[PDB]
């Protein structure tokens, strides 16, 4: 366990490093996406748009939540197990085989 | 159901729930790990252990003091060992049950009693504000909508439903708290296991997504606050408040939802004896981010003016009358209410200020006026309304409004006394503004009465009035009283700056009422009384859910209210009754009959 | 209660059979019969509770 | 679990033989009985786990 914990913390740091290296590009592109979205205040809602949103928002919400929370906890990380409580709960809820996992 | 109590803003219940969460963290349970131990088997296991330890000790004494040394003694040893296994299992179960019953139960029952006692007042306040927000939302239109508003609704409805249901269910199961106590603890533990279970769609996930939609971290960078403001600001919405007050009420309701959700989450994690996570930090982060969103991207684009919510067709005599709606020295007008149940009446709230435009709960005088319909409405001969929106500078609070109907025209004059923001004193430095002449509007004579204003004319929370203006629409024959509030400043100074906030709500009831227990809600008629053994409290009777007074033979229910009156001053009586009653305001001395 | 009864009855049966297979002394057999009667009372109480649950 | 059980059964048997074949009859023997009973509890837990695992 004592060789496990530090190895995993180092692995999470090495991951977060490249993850942050990548995140800046998608941050700028999502800023541009938000800029183009602000112009949607005059486009009324169609049945197609309503359906697509009501169909995608759950999966998108859950994926975004998992990603951002994993990043947040891996950043907060930088016995130790008492400190990795949230990360272990997240990993146990994310790698769980389920009908709606 | 309003409440005459300082509503401390988001800071108030946020810090309250933070204190409750810290207290829950301080509670010590110890060996609260054996949850799957039926506590209703204590007597059974205790009897079995008491009856089996005797046999075990008998066998032990036999094998020890006994002088037998043979494989027969070895068989006796094996028998004693099997009995020891059974006894040890029974004793382990009994020990777990005893620990859970004498360490895990008292701590938690005390903790939950405290949690509920502290949640009582928060629930009251937030339930009233939720009623108001639900009225507003009913007044909204979401049939022809924008893409961003539709996306926000799609993203916020599921989490909102989940959080609301979970909060209500946890509150019910806590108030539920012998076999009944154990069954209620089992229900609470089931709810806790469901709330705290490890799945990506957990209660915590819905909390975080609710926050992400409240701040604007969703697909489109659209915060629920922006869509709320856009829906509430439209012209169709007619509410009793300004846009600032309505969006602030929206924020109050949703932040209280989130705070109570974090409280339930902590209580569940503690009830299950799980690792603590300290959600106070996350709760404060969420609430502060949402308040900052409201303060920066929402509050500046709102109007702090509130007008009449309703209109009523009425007529008024052309008899000229002077009216002076004034506040006592050192007071300020903070709200009005035009009610025309049977006769037109105007409630006016006056109160001394304390600091940053905060209203004093102790000084909340209420005056009543009756000649408003005869003043705002013509009978048969036209009318000329002078219309001009007054706007005094900051640090000036309206104190007097003077209506003078010299002829068939209507002209009002307003006075504003200087108010020091730092202190709570209003000096006698007055600015007087009238209705400008060049802009008058005429309502032509019409047999049908004009649409007098009606409803509550005041911010969601009683605040000083900056300006007052009248407006009249000739085509529609409408009349509106648009006042201006200081809620933006009071919020930027007290709540959105994370400081002690003090807010009062329009009581929605005649505080100036002199008939104690008029609604007769307190079952014990300490104020009222019955002369003869009859005429009692009919609980089934009254305005839906109240306790009415009843009369049968010849014993009438009476209440003494002689002192709190004045001679030759006009008064208004009101009462709902069913059957064939007889009401009399009578003086024991002298046969004078005022109202009969 | 079913598991408790099974184990207790197996113990009592083993005891009784092994003591009936070979009787050695007077006081030893006396004390064995005493503790066996006590174990039988315990088993009877357990079976009474189990039958009460079955009737319920 | 198999190693632990195989290593504890020897100690349990040694204590059992000591208390049986041994001619000591005293509160010392009673304390030895208590010690053997605790060791037997540990061994029984280990053996229950091992039996469940072997069956599965």
Residue numbers in the entry:
A (entry chain A): 114 to 191, 204 to 226
B (entry chain D): 14 to 190, 202 to 620
C (entry chain C), D (entry chain B): 58 to 113
Q: Anything the authors wrote about it?
A:
In addition, Bt secretes to the medium numerous vegetative insecticidal proteins (Vip) that have been classified into three different families. Notably, members of the Vip3 family have shown to have a broad-spectrum activity against Lepidoptera4 and, since they target binding sites different to those of Cry proteins in the insect membranes, they are considered a good complement to the action of these toxins. Vip3 proteins are synthesized in an inactive state, as protoxins, and they require to be activated by proteases present in the midgut tract of the insect. To shed light on some of these questions, we have determined the near-atomic resolution structures of Vip3Aa in the protoxin and activated states by cryo-electron microscopy (cryo-EM).
Interestingly, the three-dimensional reconstruction, which converged at a global resolution of 2.9 Å, revealed that the Vip3 tetramer assembles into a pyramid-shaped structure where the N-terminal region forms the core and apex, and the C-terminal domains are exposed to the solvent. The cryo-EM structure of the protoxin reveals key insights into the molecular architecture of the protein, and shows that Vip3 is composed of five distinct domains, confirming earlier predictions. Domain I extends from the N-terminus to the primary protease cleavage site (K198), and contains four long, highly curved α-helices (α1–α4). The first helix is markedly amphipathic, and the second and third helices form an antiparallel bundle that adopts a different configuration in the outer (chains A and C) and inner monomers (chains B and D). In particular, the variable length of the α1–α2 loop allows the second and third helices of the internal monomers to rotate ∼90° compared with the external ones. This rotation further increases the curvature and tension of this element and leads to the formation of an eight-helix bundle that protrudes as a stalk from the tetrameric core formed by the subsequent domain. Notably, this second domain, composed of five α helices, embodies the core of the tetramer and plays a structural role mainly through two extended loops (comprising residues 221–226 and 239–247, respectively) that project toward the adjacent subunit and stabilize the Vip3 oligomer. In sharp contrast, the C-terminal region of Vip3 is composed of three globular domains that are mostly solvent exposed and do not show any interactions between different monomers. Domain III comprises residues 328–532 and contains three antiparallel β-sheets that form a β-prism fold strikingly similar to that found in members of the Cry insecticidal δ-endotoxins26. Notably, these two domains bear similar CBM (carbohydrate-binding module) folds that are connected by a long linker.
